[PDB]
Design a protein around this ligand. Sequence first.
Ligand SMILES: NC(=O)c1ccc[n+]([C@@H]2O[C@H](COP(=O)([O-])OP(=O)(O)OC[C@H]3O[C@@H](n4cnc5c(N)ncnc54)[C@H](O)[C@@H]3O)[C@@H](O)[C@H]2O)c1
Ligand SMILES: NC(=O)c1ccc[n+]([C@@H]2O[C@H](COP(=O)([O-])OP(=O)(O)OC[C@H]3O[C@@H](n4cnc5c(N)ncnc54)[C@H](O)[C@@H]3O)[C@@H](O)[C@H]2O)c1
Ligand SMILES: [Zn+2]
Ligand SMILES: [Zn+2]
Ligand SMILES: [Zn+2]
Ligand SMILES: [Zn+2]
Lengths: 379, 379
Amino acid sequence: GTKGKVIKCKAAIAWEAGKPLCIEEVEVAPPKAHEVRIQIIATSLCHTDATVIDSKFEGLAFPVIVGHEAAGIVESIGPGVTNVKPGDKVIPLYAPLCRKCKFCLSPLTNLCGKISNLKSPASDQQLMEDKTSRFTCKGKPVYHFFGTSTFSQYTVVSDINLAKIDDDANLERVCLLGCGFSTGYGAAINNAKVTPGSTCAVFGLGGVGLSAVMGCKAAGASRIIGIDINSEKFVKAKALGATDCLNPRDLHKPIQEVIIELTKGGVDFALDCAGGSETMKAALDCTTAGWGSCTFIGVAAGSKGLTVFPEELIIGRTINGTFFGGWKSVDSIPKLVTDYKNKKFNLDALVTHTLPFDKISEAFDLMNQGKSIRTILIF
Amino acid sequence: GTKGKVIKCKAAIAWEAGKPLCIEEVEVAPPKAHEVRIQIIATSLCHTDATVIDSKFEGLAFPVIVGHEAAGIVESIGPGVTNVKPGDKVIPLYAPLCRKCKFCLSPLTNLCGKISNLKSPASDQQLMEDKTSRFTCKGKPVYHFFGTSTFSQYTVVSDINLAKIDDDANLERVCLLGCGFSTGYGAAINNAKVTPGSTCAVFGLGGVGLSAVMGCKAAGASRIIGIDINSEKFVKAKALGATDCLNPRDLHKPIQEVIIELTKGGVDFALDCAGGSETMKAALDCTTAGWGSCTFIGVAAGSKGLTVFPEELIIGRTINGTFFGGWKSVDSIPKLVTDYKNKKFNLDALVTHTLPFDKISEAFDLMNQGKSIRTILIF
Ligand SMILES: NC(=O)c1ccc[n+]([C@@H]2O[C@H](COP(=O)([O-])OP(=O)(O)OC[C@H]3O[C@@H](n4cnc5c(N)ncnc54)[C@H](O)[C@@H]3O)[C@@H](O)[C@H]2O)c1
Ligand SMILES: NC(=O)c1ccc[n+]([C@@H]2O[C@H](COP(=O)([O-])OP(=O)(O)OC[C@H]3O[C@@H](n4cnc5c(N)ncnc54)[C@H](O)[C@@H]3O)[C@@H](O)[C@H]2O)c1
Ligand SMILES: [Zn+2]
Ligand SMILES: [Zn+2]
Ligand SMILES: [Zn+2]
Ligand SMILES: [Zn+2]
């Protein structure tokens, strides 16, 4: 039995910013009060994992185990835990649900007051609630990431940072609900609030963006324009519901102007699922006057964001954003697992590669080289 | 009998940017097809009139007759006019309602496709439909402003740029519905969509801001924080519904942080009724995470706008704006005139000064020195 014992296992550690991850042996401490130790079965790479370890990102403590998109099995539970037991299938959640704070009590948001670093949510939850870490490597502490740290074979999370899911769930596919799918799909349905018959633009056709295409389609959009600088993403996008696909590099005319001409005035809903100043600007610019909606999802390390003028809003734009697709994490994720079982949406289309966890650096290369959508890493 | 005849009258002309207005004798041509010539009875000064003739403002054609906040009486109508007749009391409208375009047909906006300059609406409608002007001075054409040009004793507007109002209306007060009151009041009700029990921050306590205070109160706000760099505005704001008033200059701590501490996390709805980079930043920053709403109203000549990071929206903010308070102009303004007759809101509180039109420069001085809210100018 490993219950109550330190577990020695493999993890991918970022020792410092701007360097590749290193496979190391780590010690994972037993869970304390209101914590759960999880054996990670499958985990995938989100662009956020790469962003936060970039030298241009500020506020992350090193050394760190990143990873936030996974599915696993409960190995053990700490004192006071009643929501899961050993053997349960679970999805670790970076978006907590304490159920008691003013944000958790509101139907208007899926934010939780546990996240106090509002200027940079991705740099919060590097320590457990008692302000210590459950990871050790080479006699020193290793920080958590986003309350999840799924690039370790065993991780420890708070009991409000996981969802118990169906016992028959495919752990090699539902891990995608841990961030990318849920974010894109939910951004369209919950944050953007895409309406039947509307026109949509989705910038960036990766894991999040393809999921936003699926979300727009489920919401009843009549036209869905996919935008990517990689035209190889277009066949998948059209298969998942994109009616049009455009590469900004194909014309000297700025993409927002191409979109405005094509739609005769702009789209109803734009979603930026790529990130950075240029995509933010194009996403806002391509929306119709009167009632145009622009939803920000993507982020870029060292970006200076977007300069906005009041006239751009005065003509009738709304700007908003998403955190984990607007889903109340602990309640919604098990329902999304059931939806997937019932074939409500196509998760398998997101998976382009499957590797052993040892080849985690290849997953980074595939992503940075634009060759993958989601790579599933198997421990 | 002036019908069909050129009218000679007084107007205040801006000959070039950055100079005071000059009272001149101008010739006003008769109205052509689908136009109405109006005798202006009372007109007031909105900050926008000063902004557009500032040297830092780009895209206004000179010489020009500004003014867009007025009430008057119809002197004559051109061919095909079915909506007003000589003698009718009217409010000229810079926000047209053509009723044909995609915007007019939508309940989601009060924009009209007649305004084609969406990057700067204030610089459109300097000419009539046929691309000519009805004003002449010293043998040369003088441009219109915002389709209204109310700083001339007689002006000519299209038949979709005015509202017929109650015969019993007080023209020296309902002129305020021509921009400032309607914008602030409507921004709270229509654009921000202030909800019962909510907390609000209104930045800038002039004509627009005090009207936003009145709007927030009417919408059921339980707390209304007024912000101004001029503390003399606070007695009026509190009288009209402000529960708290703050001057940013009183503490070294940034005003947005003072507001966050005071409300324990920020307000539900912020409205920027001042304008510029500083107020836009403070308005966005002071809003709660989760569901904070920031509405931009104010503009500043030569402003560099606001740099926004996607994280500021990801944590659950919405940003929007107002154009003339979200009112379908021609339909809503007569109803607002009736509301005023029925004492629904306090327009008189907005009037601090009344002057003959000859002293128009004093009205600018009062505004620029911060000594007025609205000055009524009487022809
Ligand atoms: N806000 C949230 O809660 C949340 C959640 C998940 C991911 N994210 C962020 O969402 C973004 C997307 O994540 P992902 O894992 O799908 O990334 P990804 O790398 O899988 O896909 C990004 C796509 O953007 C495209 N792209 C890059 N530059 C572009 C440009 N200038 N114009 C058009 N397309 C461009 C790339 O070619 C790629 O196909 C990332 O910035 C990530 O950090 C945010
Ligand atoms: N968007 C629209 O449809 C619309 C309509 C009407 C007016 N406007 C704009 O709204 C703004 C308000 O117009 P107004 O006529 O009421 O102006 P105003 O000059 O009468 O009032 C502005 C108030 O803002 C205050 N102020 C200035 N800087 C401030 C700061 N940093 N913090 C807090 N308060 C500050 C001033 O002291 C003043 O009391 C102007 O920018 C005007 O052009 C927009
Ligand atoms: Zn992610
Ligand atoms: Zn909570
Ligand atoms: Zn105005
Ligand atoms: Zn119209």
